[PDB]
Amino acid sequence: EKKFYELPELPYPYDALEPHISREQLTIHHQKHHQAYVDGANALLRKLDEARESDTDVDIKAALKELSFHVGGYVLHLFFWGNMGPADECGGEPSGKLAEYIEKDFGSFERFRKEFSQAAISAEGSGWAVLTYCQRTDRLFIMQVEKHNVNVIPHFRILLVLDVWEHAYYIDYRNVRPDYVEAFWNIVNWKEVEKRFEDIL
Amino acid sequence: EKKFYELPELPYPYDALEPHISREQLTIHHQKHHQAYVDGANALLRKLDEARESDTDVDIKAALKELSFHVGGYVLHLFFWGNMGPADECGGEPSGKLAEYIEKDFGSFERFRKEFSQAAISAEGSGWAVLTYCQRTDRLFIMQVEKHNVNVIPHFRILLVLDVWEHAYYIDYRNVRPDYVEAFWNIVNWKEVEKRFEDIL
Amino acid sequence: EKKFYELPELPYPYDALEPHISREQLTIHHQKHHQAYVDGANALLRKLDEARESDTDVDIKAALKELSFHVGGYVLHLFFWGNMGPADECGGEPSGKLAEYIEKDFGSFERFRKEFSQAAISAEGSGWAVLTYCQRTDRLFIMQVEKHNVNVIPHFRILLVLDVWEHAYYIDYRNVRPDYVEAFWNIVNWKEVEKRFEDIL
Amino acid sequence: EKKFYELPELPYPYDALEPHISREQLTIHHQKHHQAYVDGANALLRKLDEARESDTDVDIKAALKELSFHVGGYVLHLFFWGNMGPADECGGEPSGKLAEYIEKDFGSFERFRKEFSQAAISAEGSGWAVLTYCQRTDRLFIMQVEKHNVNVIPHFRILLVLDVWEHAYYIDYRNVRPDYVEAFWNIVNWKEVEKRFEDIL
Ligand SMILES: [Fe+3]
Ligand SMILES: [Fe+3]
Ligand SMILES: [Fe+3]
Ligand SMILES: [Fe+3]
Numbered sequence: 007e008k009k010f011y012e013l014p015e016l017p018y019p020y021d022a023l024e025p026h027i028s029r030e031q032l033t034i035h036h037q038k039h040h041q042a043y044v045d046g047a048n049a050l051l052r053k054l055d056e057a058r059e060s061d062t063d064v065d066i067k068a069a070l071k072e073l074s075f076h077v078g079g080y081v082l083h084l085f086f087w088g089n090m091g092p093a094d095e096c097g098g099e100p101s102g103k104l105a106e107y108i109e110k111d112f113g114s115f116e117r118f119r120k121e122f123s124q125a126a127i128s129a130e131g132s133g134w135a136v137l138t139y140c141q142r143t144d145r146l147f148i149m150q151v152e153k154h155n156v157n158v159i160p161h162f163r164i165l166l167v168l169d170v171w172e173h174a175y176y177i178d179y180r181n182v183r184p185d186y187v188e189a190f191w192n193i194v195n196w197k198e199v200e201k202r203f204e205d206i207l
Numbered sequence: 208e209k210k211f212y213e214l215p216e217l218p219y220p221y222d223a224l225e226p227h228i229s230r231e232q233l234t235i236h237h238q239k240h241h242q243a244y245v246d247g248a249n250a251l252l253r254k255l256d257e258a259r260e261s262d263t264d265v266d267i268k269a270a271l272k273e274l275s276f277h278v279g280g281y282v283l284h285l286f287f288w289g290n291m292g293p294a295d296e297c298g299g300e301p302s303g304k305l306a307e308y309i310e311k312d313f314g315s316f317e318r319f320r321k322e323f324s325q326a327a328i329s330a331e332g333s334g335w336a337v338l339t340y341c342q343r344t345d346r347l348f349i350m351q352v353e354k355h356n357v358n359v360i361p362h363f364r365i366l367l368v369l370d371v372w373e374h375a376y377y378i379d380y381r382n383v384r385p386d387y388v389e390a391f392w393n394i395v396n397w398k399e400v401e402k403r404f405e406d407i408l
Numbered sequence: 409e410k411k412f413y414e415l416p417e418l419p420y421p422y423d424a425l426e427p428h429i430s431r432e433q434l435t436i437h438h439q440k441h442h443q444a445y446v447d448g449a450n451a452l453l454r455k456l457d458e459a460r461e462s463d464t465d466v467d468i469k470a471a472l473k474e475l476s477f478h479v480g481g482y483v484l485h486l487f488f489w490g491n492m493g494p495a496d497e498c499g500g501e502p503s504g505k506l507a508e509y510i511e512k513d514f515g516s517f518e519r520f521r522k523e524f525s526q527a528a529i530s531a532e533g534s535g536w537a538v539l540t541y542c543q544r545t546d547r548l549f550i551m552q553v554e555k556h557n558v559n560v561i562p563h564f565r566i567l568l569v570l571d572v573w574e575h576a577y578y579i580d581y582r583n584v585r586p587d588y589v590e591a592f593w594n595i596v597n598w599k600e601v602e603k604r605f606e607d608i609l
Numbered sequence: 610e611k612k613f614y615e616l617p618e619l620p621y622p623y624d625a626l627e628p629h630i631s632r633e634q635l636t637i638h639h640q641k642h643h644q645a646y647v648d649g650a651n652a653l654l655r656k657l658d659e660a661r662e663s664d665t666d667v668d669i670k671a672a673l674k675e676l677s678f679h680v681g682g683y684v685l686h687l688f689f690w691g692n693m694g695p696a697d698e699c700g701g702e703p704s705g706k707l708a709e710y711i712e713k714d715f716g717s718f719e720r721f722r723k724e725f726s727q728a729a730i731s732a733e734g735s736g737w738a739v740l741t742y743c744q745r746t747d748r749l750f751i752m753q754v755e756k757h758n759v760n761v762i763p764h765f766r767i768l769l770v771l772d773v774w775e776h777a778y779y780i781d782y783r784n785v786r787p788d789y790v791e792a793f794w795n796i797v798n799w800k801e802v803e804k805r806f807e808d809i810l
Contacts, residue, residue: 009344042583058318065671066322066326066349067329067331067675068668068671068674068675070326070358071351071358071671072670072671073348073350074351074359074360075532077341078360081360081361082361085362113262117259125267125268125271130555131535131554131555133533136361140278143211143212143252144210147274148267149275150268151361152533155360155361156357157271157272157276157357158275158356159274159282160279160282160352160356160359160365161286161363162282162362164361171574172574173578173583176574177578177582180440180579181440181575235784243784266467269469269470273469273733331675331678331756332757332774333734333775353734353756354734373774374775374779377775377776377779378783381641381780382641382642411746411747412746413746453746460716460720463716468724468728468731469731469753472728472752472760475762476753476760476762479743479762480761480762483764487764515662515664527669530669531670542680544614545612545613546612549680550673551673552669552677557760557762557763559674559678559758560763561677561758561761562684562685562754562765563767564684564763566764
C-alpha cells in the first residue's frame with residue numbers, strides 16, 4: 007500500500023531562532039508554505055496513481071514539471087530546517103573535513119561565506135543557495151536554485167541550504183534580503199552540515 | 208592540487224549500438240557535445256579558481272547557472288552511455304527489485320515504458336527523461352529535465368537516463384524523435400540500472 | 409548621448425488603493441523593488457556601453473539573461489501601476505470592444521475573471537498573470553509569466569497585468585495569495601486596459 | 610466563429626537559401642518543426658475552447674506554459690523566414706535608420722554582428738538570438754531566448770531573429786553551430802528588418 011509526504015516537525019520550537027528569524031516568520035514559513043509543498047506533491051501522486059489504476063492517459067510533461075517543483079520544495083525545506091538551530095548552540099564556523107574543504111576550494115571561510123551570500127542575495131526571484139560536492143573532481147560546489155528545481159545539477163547531494171524565497175524573510179526584513187542572509191550565519195547548524203558531508207566522503 | 212573533468216571512454220565501440228544508434232550518431236554525440244560540457248565545466252572551474260587566488264569578485268549568479276548547465280551535461284551523458292549497450296546483450300525488460308518497483312509504482316512495465324516514453328517525446332526542446340527514486344515515499348519517480356538542469360529535484364539520484372536533445376538523434380532520425388525513443392528500448396542496459404537501483408535500496 | 413531608465417511616478421497617491429492594497433504595501437513595492445529593476449537594468453546598460461567603448465569582450469549570455477530579467481521587471485511594474493486605480497473609480501467590469509472580446513474568447517467575464525485568477529494564483533513562485541492578444545487568430549490570450557521574463561510569447565503586447573511576486577502582497581496578505589488576487593478586481597482600471605486594447609485593434 | 614494557426618508559406622523556394630541553408634535543411638525545419646508548433650498551438654486552443662463551452666476546469670498553469678511555448682515557436686519561425694532571403698539579394702549590411710541605431714548603440718556594425726553572433730552561439734540548448742528596441746530608452750536590445758519563450762522581455766517587438774535550435778542546422782552543419790551562424794549573415798534580409806524597425810519608430 008501507498009505512501010505519502012508529511013510535514014516534518016521542526017527540530018526546535020518556533021521561537022528557537024530569534025532574534026534572527028522571528029517566531030511569526032518561522033511559524034508561517036513552516037506551516038503554510040512547507041505544508042503547501044507536501045499537499046502539492048501528494049495531490050499529484052494521487053493523480054498519477056489514479057491514472058495508473060484506471061490505465062488512462064495523463065499529461066506527464068505538466069505532471070512531472072509540477073512534481074519536481076513540489077518535491078523540490080519539500081526536500082529543500084526539509085534540509086533547511088535541519089541546518090539551522092538556536093544561535094547560542096550554532097553559528098560560528100565549521101570544523102573537521104568540511105572546514106578543510108572550504109579552505110582548499112574557497113581559500114578561506116570568509117571567501118566561502120561571501121560567495122554563498124552572493125549566491126543567495128543575487129537570486130532572481132524565488133530560490134535558494136545550496137552547498138554540494140563533486141565526488142568526481144573532489145570539490146565543493148555552490149548552486150543557485152531558482153524556484154525549487156531550476157539550475158540544479160542532477161544527482162548532487164545537499165550539504166547546506168538557504169531559503170531566499172521572499173516568504174522566508176519578508177515578515178522580518180521586508181525587502182532587505184541582505185540583512186536576512188547576514189542574520190542566517192548566526193543560526194547555521196554546522197554540526198549537521200558536517201555530518202551530511204561525511205556521509206558522502 | 209586541483210582536479211578536473213575528463214571525457215569518459217564509452218563502455219563499448221562506437222558501432223556497438225547499431226542499427227539503433229549509428230556509429231556516426233554516437234561518435235559525434237560523444238566526441239563533440241559531451242566533450243563540450245567537459246570543457247565548459249573546466250573553463251568555469253578555472254575561472255572561479257582564479258578569482259579565489261586573486262581574491263577578486265566574480266558574477267557568481269552567472270557562474271553557477273552556467274556551472275549547473277555544464278556539469279549537468281557532463282553527469283547526464285555519463286549515466287546515459289552507461290545505461291546502454293549492444294542490442295544482443297541488452298534491451299528486454301528489467302528483473303529483480305527494479306522489476307518489482309516498476310510494477311507496484313506503474314502497474315506494469317508497459318505502463319512505465321509508455322510514461323517514460325512520453326516524458327522523452329514531449330520535452331519542449333533540449334532535455335532528458337530520467338528515472339529516480341524517493342526514499343521518503345518509497346516510490347520510483349520520473350523527471351523531465353529541460354536542458355541539463357531544469358525541472359530537476361535536487362538530491363535525487365539517477366537510475367535511468369534518456370538523452371532527447373536533438374543532437375542525440377537528428378543524424379539518424381532527423382525530426383522523428385519518437386522513432387529514436389522507440390529504438391532506445393532495444394539497447395537499454397537493465398543490468399546497470401538494476402545495479403544503480405540497489406545502491407540506494 | 410545615452411539614455412536610461414527611471415522610476416516612474418505612480419498615477420495616484422500611495423494610499424489610493426486601500427483597503428485592497430495598503431499604503432505600506434504599495435510604497436515599498438514601488439520604491440524598493442521597482443526601483444531595484446531600474447537600477448539593475450541601468451547598471452547593465454552601462455556595463456555593455458563600457459565594453460563597447462573599450463571594444464572589449466563581455467559575457468553576453470549572462471548579460472542578456474540579466475537584462476531581460478530587469479527590463480522585464482521594469483516594464484511589467486510599469487503596466488501594473490497603470491491598470492490599477494482608486495476602488496471608487498475602478499473595478500467593475502470592462503465595456504466596449506474589450507468586453508466583446510472577453511465574451512467571445514472566454515464565454516463570459518466570469519470565466520475570464522476565473523481563468524485569469526487561476527493564472528495568478530497557480531504561478532510557481534514569483535511571476536505575473538498577463539492578458540494579451542493574437543492579431544493572427546484574433547484572440548485574447550492569457551500568459552503566466554514566471555519571474556519577469558519566463559514563459560512569455562515574444563512580440564505580444566500587454567493589456568492587463570497582475571503582479572503575484574510575494575513582495576506584492578506578503579505585507580497585506582502574508583501567504584494568502586488568493587485574497588490578494590480577489591482584492592485586485594476591486595482596483596482594476598478597465599479604462600486603461602480598454603485604451604491599450606484599442607491601440608492594437 | 611473561431612480562428613486558428615496555419616503554416617505560412619515561405620517567401621521563396623526551398624533552395625532559395627543555398628549553399629548557406631540547404632534545401633533539405635530548410636524543407637524539414639519548415640514542414641516538420643514549424644508545423645509542429647502550428648499543431649501544438651491549435652490543439653491547445655481547442656482544448657481551452659472545449660473547457661469553456663462545457664464550463665469545466667482546466668489546468669491553466671500547464672495550458673498557458675505550453676501555449677506560450679508553441680505560439681512562441683510559431684511567431685519566431687514566422688519572423689525568421691521573413692528576415693532571410695536569396696544570398697544575391699540579401700546579406701550585406703543595413704542602411705537608413707537601422708544602420709544609424711546599430712552604430713550609436715553598438716559602436717559599429719561589426720560590434721553588433723559580433724555580439725549578436727555570441728548571443729546565438731552561446732545559447733544553452735535550444736533558442737534564438739533576437740534584435741529588438743526599447744522605445745523608453747531609445748536603444749536597440751538583443752535578447753537571448755531559450756526555447757521559444759524563456760528570457761524574453763514581454764511587450765518588446767521583433768526586428769531580427771536567428772533560430773539556433775539544433776534542428777535549424779544539424780543537417781548542414783552537425784555540431785558546428787558557429788559555421789551556421791556565420792553563414793546566416795549571407796542571407797539576412799535587411800530590407801525586411803529595416804521595414805520592421807520603421808513601424809515602431
Ligand atoms: Fe520557503
Ligand atoms: Fe547529448
Ligand atoms: Fe513586483
Ligand atoms: Fe526552429
